[PDB]
């Protein structure tokens with residue numbers, strides 16, 4: 001493919017993302033002032049770990065649906081065999097949610113948008129996972145500090161889903177070509193937007209997997 005075809009791929013991936021971004025960026029930034037009261041935090045803190053794991057897993061399932069809808073809106077992904085479409089979505093859907101999460105994160109007060117309002121990491125106190133909640137706040141802080149754009153999330157998550165390294169793939173070569181083109185599309189877009197600077201400042205690829213595997217470990221016990 002040509003440089004015009006790489007540009008078209010960027011546009012397409014960014015179009016698919018915007019159509020499935022779940023919550024509008026403009027809405028999320030406006031709601032940054034809409035913070036939960038002390039009695040509202042207390043209300044969540046009083047809830048059972050099972051009630052909180054039920055709510056979090058409900059929102060996670062909901063978020064994963066938009067991720068599946070994002071991958072379904074990618075031409076190359078649809079061309080893959082069903083087993084490969086499943087293998088990539090099972091291994092990457094939750095990792096994509098953890099990346100998408102930075103839009104709902106506010107670095108000015110260390111709060112995240114959860115159930116209509118912004119709340120601190122003390123909102124999730126009931127789970128008994130202070131280490132795990134800190135880990136997802138720190139990860140969203142590492143991306144929000146960089147001011148990770150909508151298009152940047154779009155291309156990064158496309159690379160998270162399309163990874164030929166995943167075990168269980170039959171058409172590894174086909175996925176490799178899709179990964180290579182998206183890698184080329186990501187770097188080309190960073191040049192066009194003068195964001196080459198953020199590449200070295202991004203999470204060390206393997207960290208997202210370390211964070212996700214530790215979370216599925218805690219989740220599998222309750223779901």
Ligand SMILES: CC(=O)N1CCN(C(=O)N2CC[C@](c3ccc(C(O)(C(F)(F)F)C(F)(F)F)cc3)(S(=O)(=O)c3ccc(F)cc3)C2)CC1
Pocket residue numbers: 021022023028055056057059060061063097100101103104112113114124129132133136137215216218219
């Ligand atoms: C704007 C946008 O696209 N968004 C923002 C709103 N959404 C979220 O942020 N979502 C949807 C579900 C969210 C979510 C649920 C559960 C986890 C866990 O790691 C857990 F251990 F923490 F529980 C897992 F259960 F996996 F173990 C992680 C994320 S959430 O909103 O419930 C949430 C946000 C911040 C947070 F500290 C904790 C939870 C993330 C969806 C994506």
